[PDB]
Structures are given as structure tokens and as C-alpha cells.
């Protein structure tokens with residue numbers, strides 16, 4: 001169903017693109033001849049990424065460096081990126097504040113910083129981007145976790161932030177549908193991926209089979225291109241099977257059948 | 267299983283207790299002879315609530331008015347509620363910021379405010395209350411919604427905050443299980459209730475199926491008294507059947523049992 005040609009000449013933002021899955025998504029998109037604007041705080045690393053993009057065959061490639069603790073920077077970044085590409089077809093929200101596995105004691109600072117960078121900035125990014133995306137019938141891809149669907153210890157702040165994205169973005173997806181905004185929203189639920197940060201964070205306590213970041217990046221990109229609601233990716237097929245929430249879908253649907261302005265009408 | 271006598275002379279905080287479901291939890295707890303401290307912004311209204319509590323037979327009843335937009339008020343409130351009662355056996359976190367059913371557009375401020383009042387304050391209140399609760403082996407009750415489990419239009423900010431409640435609190439519940447912290451956590455997933463806020467906000471055409479707030483309040487108390495992880499309450503038993511998510515239990519235990 002998917003063809004890499006689908007991304008040729010397309011206009012794409014990737015946040016969190018200095019390393020990990022973000023860097024990989026930038027590279028896959030370059031290979032397909034996209035225009036790409038990448039972002040992160042290290043300008044020095046971003047420069048290297050931007051170079052291997054050009055090398056790979058990107059229609060173009062630029063960076064803008066900054067912290068997504070700064071909502072003003074979030075807004076300005078999207079405008080600056082849009083000017084650079086003359087538009088925007090896809091927005092890949094991927095970055096997070098640095099975290100590590102710990103029991104939770106009192107760190108309200110960390111819960112709040114997590115909610116700001118991981119959640120609030122995804123919203124501020126979306127609001128800046130939407131005019132451009134509405135005109136191009138674009139797509140928003142929101143990168144998330146198993147831990148944003150199910151409960152695990154040692155990541156409370158991080159999980160609250162990721163659960164937050166599901167509720168916010170899944171809700172506004174219903175709104176776009178009834179009010180005919182033809183922008184797609186794709187939520188990506190990943191298991192352990194073999195990025196360097198993840199492998200460092202985990203080398204103390206139960207690793208299981210991390211999955212490969214290269215195929216992960218491409219699965220995320222396939223999802224967004226195909227306008228799927230959700231992408232799942234994990235090294236175990238049991239875990240894949242059990243992530244779907246069929247009865248949530250039934251509940252959401254019974255509501256929509258009963259109350260959408262367009263109940264009858266197809 | 268549940269007996270009213272279980273709450274007799276117990277030390278309980280109830281937030282958002284000036285109106286709706288929380289007011290009703292205050293009263294039910296009063297009939298059972300609990301010590302209760304209530305909170306919210308409406309000082310005149312909270313006073314009348316407290317009066318009715320003594321009348322109904324509360325061991326004691328007091329209020330402390332304030333806004334849960336202010337994290338430092340949140341902290342101080344638990345310390346004060348603790349001194350008044352000597353301790354805390356149960357923390358019922360129930361309040362929310364004002365919300366209407368609207369399509370989302372630009373209002374980052376509303377998203378932030380929802381996150382602070384509906385979610386961050388709950389976390390600040392847990393931290394302040396955890397020592398007392400540790401030494402009483404008590405219970406934390408977090409009130410949430412179907413819209414904290416499933417996605418509906420017209421409540422984006424609100425759902426973010428409730429989903430966030432689930433992720434944070436179900437995560438630390440796992441932590442207390444591993445580190446043998448003997449405090450229970452109960453997440454309540456509510457359908458439409460006949461509180462005056464809901465009836466103002468929701469159209470006439472759905473009013474039919476709003477559950478009674480009195481029964482809703484007693485169920486919340488029962489769940490936490492019995493240390494149940496979740497409590498479901500909705501006027502349709504069909505919605506209740508569908509709310510459970512066995513797949514998530516399994517994934518959680520597939521990790522936990524290693």
C-alpha cells in the first residue's frame with residue numbers, strides 16, 4: 001500500500017531529530033527526497049544530521065535549534081520552518097525531556113517539566129502548524145509509548161505526559177472528523193527501541209529485546225503517510241496483539257453513531 | 267463486604283466538596299460518623315456544607331477555602347487538615363476547573379489551567395499527604411471519567427488531564443506494590459451524573475441517562491474503603507461491561523511477574 005515516492009518533495013518537520021528515532025526519521029525522509037526541517041537543542045549535532053540528509057538525497061534540509069520548554073520558541077519555530085519550505089505537509093512531534101528510571105518521591109519539578117516539554121509543547125506546535133496543514137490536507141504524527149497506554153513503575157511523570165497526549169490528540173481527532181478538518185492524526189505506541197539513551201537508561205534493570213530504531217522510524221513514517229490512527233511497534237508479537245483496545249473503539253463508536261451532527265448522511 | 271462502620275471516626279479529606287459529587291461524599295461520610303475536612307473556593311457554601319455534616323452526625327467537620335490553581339495552597343491545606351484531625355486515613359481528590367463542551371481552537375491557557383487544577387494539584391496533594399497516609403495505611407481516591415478512558419469530542423483539555431491522572435496514579439500504584447508502601451489507590455471512572463454542573467453543560471436530549479449523585483458518592487467511598495483499584499459507575503450496565511480492559515492488565519503483569 002505504501003510507496004516511498006509518497007514522501008517525494010513533501011514538506012516535513014521532525015522534532016527531537018538530533019539523535020534516536022528522530023535522527024532516523026530525518027534520514028529515511030531524506031532518502032525519499034523530502035524537504036525536512038529538523039530541531040533539537042544541540043546546533044552542533046543538528047548540523048551533522050542536516051549534512052547526511054543532503055547527502056542521502058533530501059529535496060532540501062535545514063535546522064533550527066532551541067528548547068521546547070520555551071513555548072514562544074515552539075510557535076516561532078513552526079513559522080520559521082514553514083517559511084523555509086514554503087509550506088508544511090507533515091508534523092512529526094517526537095522530542096521529550098530527558099528522563100531516567102526512578103521511583104517517584106517528591107519531584108514536582110520533574111512532573112511539571114515533563115508535562116511542559118512532552119505534552120504542552122506538542123499542542124503549541126500543533127496550533128502553530130494547523131493553518132499550513134489545513135491548506136495541504138496534511139498530517140500530524142505524535143510519538144508515544146506502551147507506557148502511554150498501560151501502567152509501569154519507574155516512569156510516573158513520563159507516563160502521565162504520554163497518557164495526556166492520547167486523551168488530547170484522540171479527542172481533537174473526533175473533532176476534526178465532525179467539523180471536516182482534513183488533517184490526519186497518528187498516535188505511535190512503541191516498546192523499547194534500541195536508541196542510545198534508552199539503552200543507557202535501561203542497562204541497570206530488565207532489558208528485554210529492544211526493537212531496531214531504523215525499522216521503527218520507517219513504520220512511524222508509513223503510519224503518517226497512510227493516515228492510520230495508531231501505529232504499534234514492539235519486538236514481541238504478544239505485546240503487539242495486547243495493545244489494541246477493541247472495547248474502547250466500540251464505546252467511542254456507539255457515541256459517534258448516536259450524536260455526531262452527521263449521524264445519518266454519507 | 268462494605269459496612270458503614272468502616273468509616274466511623276476515620277480522618278478524611280474531600281476536595282471539590284462545595285458542590286456536586288463531593289458535597290454528597292461529605293454528607294455520606296458525615297452520616298457514618300467520620301472526621302471530615304472539606305475544600306473548594308466558595309467559603310459561604312462550604313460553611314453550610316460543614317453545618318449539615320454536624321447535623322448528620324460527623325465526628326467533626328471543618329472547611330479550608332482556596333484555589334487549587336495555587337500549588338502552595340495545596341501543600342499548606344493538607345498540613346492544616348492533618349493538624350486539625352491528628353492524621354489522615356483517606357484522601358479524596360475530586361475537584362476540577364470549569365469546563366464547557368466546545369471545539370478546541372487556540373486556547374493554550376485553558377489546556378494549561380486544566381492540567382494544573384485537574385492534574386498537577388492532585389500530585390502536589392498526594393506528596394503532602396503521603397507521610398500521614400503511610401502511617402495510617404490509608405487510601406487515595408482519584409475521581410475521573412469515561413472521558414479519562416475513552417476519547418470524545420468537545421473535551422480535549424479535560425480528557426488530557428484525566429488520562430494524565432490514570433497514567434500517573436496507576437504508575438505509582440505499581441511503585442507502591444514493589445516498594446511495599448501500604449497505601450491504596452482507587453481511580454473512579456464515572457458516567458454522566460445528575461450534578462448541576464453537568465445538567466447546565468449538557469443539553470436536554472442527554473439528561474435522561476444521568477446517574478444519581480447520591481448513589482455515585484457512596485460508590486466512590488465504598489471502592490476506596492475496600493481498596494479496589496478502580497470503581498466504575500454509569501447508569502448503563504452496558505457501558506460498565508465495556509469499560510474494563512483485560513489486555514492492559516495482562517501487559518502490566520507480563521512485566522510485573524518477571
Ligand SMILES: NC(=O)c1ccc[n+]([C@@H]2O[C@H](COP(=O)([O-])OP(=O)(O)OC[C@H]3O[C@@H](n4cnc5c(N)ncnc54)[C@H](OP(=O)(O)O)[C@@H]3O)[C@@H](O)[C@H]2O)c1
Pocket residue numbers: 015016017018019020021022039040041042045066067068069094095096097098117143144145146190191192193194195196197198
Ligand atoms: N527509545 C525508546 O525505547 C522509546 C520507547 C517508547 C517511546 N519512545 C519515544 O520516542 C521518542 C524519541 O525517543 P528517543 O529514544 O529517540 O529519544 P532520544 O534519542 O533521547 O532523543 C531525544 C531528542 O529530543 C531532543 N530534546 C531533548 N530535550 C529537548 C528539549 N528540551 N527541547 C527540544 N528538544 C529536546 C534531544 O536533543 P537535544 O538534547 O540536543 O535537545 C533529542 O534529539 C520519544 O518521544 C519517546 O518518548 C522511545
Ligand SMILES: NC(=O)c1ccc[n+]([C@@H]2O[C@H](COP(=O)([O-])OP(=O)(O)OC[C@H]3O[C@@H](n4cnc5c(N)ncnc54)[C@H](OP(=O)(O)O)[C@@H]3O)[C@@H](O)[C@H]2O)c1
Pocket residue numbers: 281282283284285286287288305306307308309332333334335360361362363364383409410411412456457458459460461462463464
Ligand atoms: N458530573 C458528571 O457528569 C461527571 C462525569 C464524569 C466525571 N465527573 C467527575 O466528578 C468530579 C466532580 O464533578 P461534579 O459534577 O460534581 O462537579 P461540580 O459539581 O462542578 O463540583 C466541582 C467542585 O470542584 C470545585 N472547584 C472548581 N474550581 C476549583 C478550584 N480552582 N480550586 C478548588 N476547587 C475548585 C468546585 O468548587 P468551587 O467553585 O467552590 O471552587 C466544586 O466544589 C470531577 O472530578 C469530575 O471530573 C463528573
Ligand SMILES: CCCSc1nc(N2CCN(C)CC2)ccc1C(=O)N[C@@H]1[C@@H]2C[C@@H]3C[C@H]1C[C@@](O)(C3)C2
Pocket residue numbers: 099100101145146147152153154155158190191192197198201202208239520521
Ligand atoms: C520499566 C518501565 C520502562 S518504560 C517502558 N517500558 C516498556 N515495556 C517494559 C516492560 N516490557 C514487558 C515491555 C516494554 C516499553 C517502553 C517503555 C519506554 O517508553 N521507555 C522509555 C522511557 C524510560 C527510559 C527508557 C525509554 C526511553 C526514555 O527516554 C528513558 C523514556
Ligand SMILES: CCCSc1nc(N2CCN(C)CC2)ccc1C(=O)N[C@@H]1[C@@H]2C[C@@H]3C[C@H]1C[C@@](O)(C3)C2
Pocket residue numbers: 255364365366367411412413418419420421424456457458463464467468505
Ligand atoms: C460529549 C462528551 C462529554 S464528556 C463525557 N461524556 C460521557 N459519555 C457521553 C455519552 N454516553 C453514551 C457515555 C458517556 C460521559 C461523561 C463525560 C464527562 O466527563 N462529562 C463532564 C465534563 C463535560 C461536562 C459534563 C461533565 C461535567 C463537566 O464539568 C461538564 C466536565
Ligand SMILES: [Cl-]
Pocket residue numbers: 019020021194195196197
Ligand atoms: Cl541512538
